Design an enzyme around this catalytic site. Structure first.
Site, PDB file in Angstrom:
ATOM      1  CG  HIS A 136      -5.502  -3.921  -8.515  1.00 50.06           C
ATOM      2  ND1 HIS A 136      -4.520  -4.144  -9.447  1.00 50.06           N
ATOM      3  CD2 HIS A 136      -6.383  -4.947  -8.640  1.00 50.06           C
ATOM      4  CE1 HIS A 136      -4.762  -5.287 -10.077  1.00 50.06           C
ATOM      5  NE2 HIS A 136      -5.875  -5.805  -9.582  1.00 50.06           N
ATOM      6  CG  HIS A 195      -0.507   2.756  -3.644  1.00 53.80           C
ATOM      7  ND1 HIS A 195       0.821   2.383  -3.530  1.00 53.80           N
ATOM      8  CD2 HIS A 195      -1.207   2.079  -2.709  1.00 53.80           C
ATOM      9  CE1 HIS A 195       0.881   1.433  -2.599  1.00 53.80           C
ATOM     10  NE2 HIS A 195      -0.329   1.248  -2.055  1.00 53.80           N
ATOM     11  CG  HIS A 219      -4.844   0.894   0.187  1.00 57.97           C
ATOM     12  ND1 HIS A 219      -4.955  -0.207  -0.642  1.00 57.97           N
ATOM     13  CD2 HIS A 219      -3.516   1.181   0.268  1.00 57.97           C
ATOM     14  CE1 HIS A 219      -3.719  -0.669  -0.890  1.00 57.97           C
ATOM     15  NE2 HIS A 219      -2.829   0.175  -0.394  1.00 57.97           N
ATOM     16  CD  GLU A 229      -4.438  -1.738   2.403  1.00 63.06           C
ATOM     17  OE1 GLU A 229      -3.196  -1.551   2.353  1.00 63.06           O
ATOM     18  OE2 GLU A 229      -5.052  -2.504   1.650  1.00 63.06           O
ATOM     19  CG  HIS A 284       0.237   2.251   1.631  1.00 63.66           C
ATOM     20  ND1 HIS A 284      -0.451   1.089   1.345  1.00 63.66           N
ATOM     21  CD2 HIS A 284      -0.013   2.530   2.917  1.00 63.66           C
ATOM     22  CE1 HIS A 284      -1.081   0.661   2.427  1.00 63.66           C
ATOM     23  NE2 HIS A 284      -0.846   1.525   3.417  1.00 63.66           N
ATOM     24  CB  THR A 306      -1.718  -4.295   1.879  1.00 58.29           C
ATOM     25  OG1 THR A 306      -1.802  -3.183   0.978  1.00 58.29           O
ATOM     26  CG2 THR A 306      -0.969  -3.855   3.152  1.00 58.29           C
TER      27      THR A 306
HETATM   28  O1  LIG Z   1       1.021  -3.674  -1.650  1.00 58.71           O
HETATM   29  N1  LIG Z   1       2.019  -3.051  -2.238  1.00 58.71           N
HETATM   30  C1  LIG Z   1       2.374  -3.384  -3.525  1.00 58.71           C
HETATM   31  C2  LIG Z   1       3.397  -2.687  -4.170  1.00 58.71           C
HETATM   32  C3  LIG Z   1       3.785  -3.052  -5.505  1.00 58.71           C
HETATM   33  F1  LIG Z   1       4.199  -1.970  -6.157  1.00 58.71           F
HETATM   34  F2  LIG Z   1       4.771  -3.942  -5.453  1.00 58.71           F
HETATM   35  F3  LIG Z   1       2.744  -3.581  -6.141  1.00 58.71           F
HETATM   36  C4  LIG Z   1       4.046  -1.681  -3.523  1.00 58.71           C
HETATM   37  C5  LIG Z   1       3.678  -1.335  -2.246  1.00 58.71           C
HETATM   38  C6  LIG Z   1       2.651  -2.029  -1.602  1.00 58.71           C
HETATM   39  S1  LIG Z   1       2.163  -1.568  -0.040  1.00 58.71           S
HETATM   40 ZN   LIG Z   2      -0.771   0.080  -0.496  1.00 63.44          ZN
END
Ligand SMILES: On1cc(C(F)(F)F)ccc1=S
Ligand SMILES: [Zn+2]
Length: 257
Positions: free
Chosen positions: A61, A91, A93, A103, A116, A195
């Protein structure tokens, strides 16, 4: 399983993750005119001098740059936060075109990408217990615009060839995330969620007002990654962003006038 395509994208997620239509989902549009200055907010404290990166992973992803979070090495505090939040990974987006990819949006403006930096509240002991709590996470969100290159990003761009497909990882030690920060730490903050699935409502969002600039070549390289695994039909990793969600009964607060 979930993803970003026509058949498994954001408008589908609610069927496996009903919290998708919850009361504090992310991202949101930041209406700058209605975000009130809150003079009780503190300057954010970003303490990354001792950060220990370990690895970079294509998870199908996005790609995650992972840190050793076994001690208080790279922490976020101050701002709207009570206590100390430890960096675990960052990471991005991004879009298939420079006109989209972030986002959060700012007065409906989409940036080319959004970084993020994910942190967990150390009062909960580790990441998995923190995501069971409404104040478990703090995510520092930083927008990317296409212009001048960001020199601090290039080590990430240069390793992506080695993690093209889902499930690939690479050693990624000694990367300094300070090189991804803009000059100013002025921010907006609101309570929200992850998200991607599982969309948990754990996150104090802190979104910096100042974007960083990255070059068109840097973002082009993000777009050569793949959502698929090795040996599968090639599906470029682009447009891995969730659109803005209803603000509901929330206020966005500004740290600056
Ligand atoms: O959306 N998201 C998901 C994660 C994880 F690692 F839990 F998958 C961490 C941060 C965010 S923004
Ligand atoms: Zn993210």
């Amino acid at each position: 399983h979930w993803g970003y395509g026509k058949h498994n994208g954001p408008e589908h997620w609610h069927k496996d993750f009903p919290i998708a239509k919850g009361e504090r989902q992310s991202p949101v549009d930041i209406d700058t005119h209605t975000a009130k200055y809150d003079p009780s907010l503190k300057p954010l404290s970003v303490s990354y001098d001792q950060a220990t990166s370990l690895r970079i992973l294509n998870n199908g992803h996005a790609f995650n740059v992972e840190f050793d979070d076994s001690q208080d090495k790279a922490v976020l505090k101050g701002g709207p936060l009570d206590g100390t939040y430890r960096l675990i990974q960052f990471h991005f987006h991004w879009g298939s075109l420079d006109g989209q990819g972030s986002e959060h949006t700012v007065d409906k403006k989409k940036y080319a990408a959004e970084l993020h930096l994910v942190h967990w509240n150390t009062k909960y002991g580790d990441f998995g217990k923190a995501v069971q709590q409404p104040d478990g996470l703090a995510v520092l969100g930083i927008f990317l615009k296409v212009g001048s290159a960001k020199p601090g990003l290039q080590k990430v761009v240069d390793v992506l060839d080695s993690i093209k497909t889902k499930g690939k990882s690479a050693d990624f030690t000694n990367f300094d995330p300070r090189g991804l920060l803009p000059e100013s730490l002025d921010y907006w903050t609101y309570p929200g969620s992850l998200t991607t699935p599982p969309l948990l409502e754990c996150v104090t969002w802190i979104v910096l007002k100042e974007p960083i600039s990255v070059s068109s070549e840097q973002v082009l390289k993000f777009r050569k990654l793949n959502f698929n695994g090795e040996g599968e039909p090639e599906e470029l990793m682009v447009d891995n962003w969730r659109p803005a969600q209803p603000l509901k009964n929330r206020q966005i607060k500004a740290s600056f006038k």
